[PDB]
DNA sequence: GCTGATGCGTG
DNA sequence: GTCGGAC
DNA sequence: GTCCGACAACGCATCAGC
């Protein structure tokens, strides 16, 4: 209709044709997307964000259906389906260089402003490009921007960075109004709308339900909910939402789903897109549980099983009819080339009656000499891309815990009791290569407590807890965190807790813009009377506690570090702090660090020690830095892990 | 040919 | 990965 | 409970710079 600068997708009674800012068949302008992002970021209520995105999506369906897929990817800040592994190869480094060049400003000035504002988008938006001619280029389109992001991602090899920067600069030259803000945020990986995958799916199912695709233009049906009561409309949209969600969870690939949606409609979608070996599916996740009593409350009177939670990496293993094997990560990345050793062992793990399967396993580093699990850190030293089986140094043992598909049968809707029985009967254990997760079926609190203790003695993180028959399916769309995770470090007063000295602060980004988002912590090295950086810290405080930290630390800001504070390879703090505050910090584990100097030389000649999953517990007002946890005590904690 | 910075990705 | 905020 | 985005350590792969 008129200028996209006035586009209002949050408008009441939004009409997909009359309230759009482009004409039928025209390319969706990128400014329409940016204005939608603005209206989403302005609100706190997720369902209001969904309504606003739905409005844009309904206009796209009604007016410009070829742009639906790029608009969806822009809204997710994705480049394509996850198993294809497209990635920009752009972070703040390349982006800030491009912004500096685009605006003719010094890199260090742009970088400082980005830190201060806590958002690269605001820096890119408020500076004019020294390349822009008098007459600007034509307005950016949603599909055009998306294609340029993909162009950036496809550039590889020597001198590819300069080519990426040229594309980015070209985008900024053509930006108008709020566009540069969101192109910059997209490139930095921090769109930070408050709306992500689940809201995008809800907006999409609502949009195609209210404004059906494939109508002769002008569409006779622009709002198919209008003839329903609010109550009936709600039930209908919820049911349509679940159709899309369950399909996506089984086939998380918009390249596959959107063409079907536009051609056949949402009600027919599950006939055309179904779970199948070779296509990765969304894995079941776990909800953290802070005690066995919380477990029993959550699973009330539902029989459940406890399993060791192995400390490795998830491997979703697919065997297709015909013999091909694929392996995917928890995030649906294709890891087949990383595990030639697993591929060769598949004939050894499955009985010959098994013709196809999808297995849910943990890959764990395994010492064949000592016949014992090795730490996560050892597993991460595996090579990633096209490994050959002869060159493997770190062997892996698979710990299998679920079966999602068998001999052409999807088990998504089957109870774990049956899925587990099919797993145990149709696959073959080999010690140190493929074994079923150690498990316990019980409701006795004391057996569970002992099992949790035993899992930690047996090199695991704690327990997974899973119902066997009540709400015990693998339907991620119904509940994505259907399993519980119980770790010792969740229990109040249990686990590795340290008192550490605050030696630096980092300016916050995004939700933390305008205050500190993170802090640099140190342990006390008695031998050298130095404070040694041990880790950064960025979670565990409430918003109120974070404002209190900002107040209590402001007087401690130094221009230059104290001579007895050693940070070696740590990120230099934005504000150095006079060592004074002592905070209680909890972690899951201690790790040998390539950068942190804490306790260097006490366990390893070259490496100090850091904290895995550190979080703030409380301030120790009754401790001064000389009573903080010592670097010797840190070393003792690390050795005790064995 | 090598190294450190950068990016992606796992947890 | 942990965590807290908004719903 | 769900969803989201602040923030953690640290591995391999890649590429600019040398
Ligand atoms: P997040 O804290 O959601 O943890 C889930 C991951 O735990 C791993 N895992 C190890 N052992 C198990 C068992 N027995 N069952 C399920 N998941 C397990 C997986 O890698 C998960 O992704």
Kindly report how far apart the N and C termini lie. 68 Å
- How many distinct beta strands? 22
Instruction: Quickly give the structural class.
Output: alpha+beta
The value of Rg in angstroms is 27 Å
* CATH topology group of the largest domain: DNA ligase i, domain 1
Total number of helical segments? 20
**Judging from the principal axes of the Cα atoms, what is the shape?**
globular
The CATH homologous superfamily of the largest domain is called DNA ligase, ATP-dependent, N-terminal domain
Major β-sheet annotation: 8 strands, mixed
Query: Which ligands does the model contain, each kind named once?
Result: adenosine monophosphate
Binding site for Mg(2+) 1: 362
Catalytic activity: ATP + (deoxyribonucleotide)n-3'-hydroxyl + 5'-phospho-(deoxyribonucleotide)m = (deoxyribonucleotide)n+m + AMP + diphosphate
Subunit structure: Interacts with PCNA. Interacts with POLB.
Family: Belongs to the ATP-dependent DNA ligase family.
